[model samples]
Target: MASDMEEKFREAFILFSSCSDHIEMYKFFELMNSFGIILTNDEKAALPNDINMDYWLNFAKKHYNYEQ
Candidate 1:
């Protein structure tokens, strides 16, 4: 029962995490930054590979209160 916005964010988060190429992931970050959605240093360090699907799924569930 996640909110649409939270679901969309989770989807994008998963897509970024699934990228195999580091350059591609970097480009994604660049695109987001261009739109003013800056990532914190810790989040930047936890890019593509460091972001597993489970992490985002759990994050969305716990932090976002998906059932809300």
Candidate 2:
């Protein structure tokens, strides 16, 4: 996975993982948004039902083409 997204995953993981192993889709979307990460419907469609750092990091590599 890309370091950028991985780092964000680390940040998000710290909060969410503290409370749960996986998160709901709606909460996942909000978490992504909180990190300034946007998603397309098509891209989001490919995501798994339960979001964890592994799935999130993998999807981020597939969805994100550019890095700041």
Candidate 3:
């Protein structure tokens, strides 16, 4: 069985994968809330207004520390 931290990480990955647009972003935000992950203002600001490659790149870099 997965530990709670692993579950959270899985949820976060799902949330990240589901992010496609503003609506999807909000849905991801709600999912994070359901997982008790509180997003900071800076994190919120990182979400894309439109489908911009740079936005998602920077967002992933900032939040997940993943190289784009």
Candidate 4:
């Protein structure tokens, strides 16, 4: 799946950030799941409440491991 992290986050950001300034809590998880990155509560606690492109990018950078 060797996708581009920035671009993948960009696509998700566009989808989730369309109607709001930040990606909401539920949608953020959905976005993470869409990227195959289901997080635990402990892991989720480390991130921001309102997710933006920078946050999403960094999150993906840390967690995203798209293998073939």
Candidate with top TM-score is: 4
Clashes of each: 0, 0, 0, 0
Flag the better candidate by TM-score, 3 or 4: 4
Q: What are the per-residue Cα lDDT tens digits for candidate 1 across 1-68?
A: 35665567555664564653223557556435433466678977776555344554554444443243
lDDT order of candidates, top first: 4, 2, 1, 3
Candidate 2's C-alpha runs over 4 A off are 1-8, 61-67
lDDT of 3 by residue, 2-59 (tens): 2444555554555565643333666656645654556789967876655333443344
Question: Please, what are the lDDT tens digits per residue for candidate 4 over residues 30-67?
Answer: 88888788798988887767777778888887887666
Model 3 residue 19 lDDT score: 47
TM-score of each: 0.35, 0.61, 0.39, 0.77
Model 2 agreement with the true structure over 1-68: per-residue lDDT tens digits: 46766786767765755667787788778777766679889978987777777776676666555655
Worst 10 residues of 3 by lDDT: 59-68
Q: List the residue pairs that clash in candidate 4.
A: none
Candidate 1: regions farther than 4 A off: 17-36, 40-49, 57-68
Local error of candidate 4 at residue 67 (angstroms): 2.1
